[PDB]
Design an enzyme around this catalytic site. Sequence first.
Site, PDB file in Angstrom:
ATOM      1  N   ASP A  35      10.230 -13.733 -27.223  1.00  0.00           N
ATOM      2  CA  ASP A  35      11.153 -14.613 -26.650  1.00  0.00           C
ATOM      3  C   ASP A  35      11.963 -13.629 -25.884  1.00  0.00           C
ATOM      4  O   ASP A  35      12.862 -12.688 -26.204  1.00  0.00           O
ATOM      5  CB  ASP A  35      12.158 -14.965 -28.013  1.00  0.00           C
ATOM      6  CG  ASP A  35      13.243 -15.653 -27.587  1.00  0.00           C
ATOM      7  OD1 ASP A  35      13.681 -16.063 -26.076  1.00  0.00           O
ATOM      8  OD2 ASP A  35      14.221 -16.186 -28.251  1.00  0.00           O
ATOM      9  N   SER A 199      17.319 -17.205  -8.193  1.00  0.00           N
ATOM     10  CA  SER A 199      16.303 -17.937  -7.432  1.00  0.00           C
ATOM     11  C   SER A 199      16.955 -18.210  -5.930  1.00  0.00           C
ATOM     12  O   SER A 199      18.087 -18.733  -5.960  1.00  0.00           O
ATOM     13  CB  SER A 199      15.954 -19.012  -8.262  1.00  0.00           C
ATOM     14  OG  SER A 199      14.984 -19.768  -7.197  1.00  0.00           O
TER      15      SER A 199
END
Length: 330
Positions: A35, A199
């Site tokens: 994770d 992004s």
Amino acid sequence: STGSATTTPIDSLDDAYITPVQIGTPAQTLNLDFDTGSSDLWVFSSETTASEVDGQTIYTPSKSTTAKLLSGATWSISYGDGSSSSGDVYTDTVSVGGLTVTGQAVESAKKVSSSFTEDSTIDGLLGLAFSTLNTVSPTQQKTFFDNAKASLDSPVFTADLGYHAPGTYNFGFIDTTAYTGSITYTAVSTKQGFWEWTSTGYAVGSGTFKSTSIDGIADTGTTLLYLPATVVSAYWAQVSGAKSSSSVGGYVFPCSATLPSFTFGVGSARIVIPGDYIDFGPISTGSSSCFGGIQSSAGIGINIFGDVALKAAFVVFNGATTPTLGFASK
């Protein structure tokens, strides 16, 4: 040193991935959920409330000759998806795909929430975010990667998640045969303890690329892709019959649909998520309404590049002094 371990979807829809981890002496092998969105390595154990264990493999520290109770230490974690667990702490030897750390804090669950109990395939979590998020008290503990970093050939690990198939987590090296083209690296902020990046925009299907900054985290421990409601609405607008269902808790779409792809930008490069990656199947057994793999981050408070996005890429988690992320197509 290096390590290389295969990571395997827990079911037919890639609802999560498990990776085998050797703990203790002799080795006890548990299948953990790696994770990059958390920083605790915790396991079902012989200490876990019996009614809260249902099929998981447990760690029994008393059967490990290298296990030592970390005196006074406790942990308690709550995840964004509402799940939780808590317990005490041992140090023990932990190996992943050949790579061994001695004195790793293994957090032993005394309590887990129902979603963990009901997940017979996940024996625990191995956190790979930054150790600043580790919940052990009163002495914060380091992640497996943090402990390993100095010994690694290169202070990196890579996530190569498969679509409806096994993939790979590598530590200490970049497998130049596992991706196509080049790796585009992008800046990371560790200020929230995550692998947080920006992004450069998105496209829906064969549509034009929208240049826009989307701050979010690369999180292998989140299954879906969570993005701003504007972005998500633009995606599902392209699927006839798709709608947001408050009763189901997200965007649903007709299972008869062919989903468009979704492209996200990494610097000047582009990762294309195939439409099939965005189908998480019927909302209930037998239903012709399917759950979408792209969902709104509104009300999470952070955008999450989860498995839906990451599995479309070869992802480098570069833990150099100034960390960065790299993405390649594959």
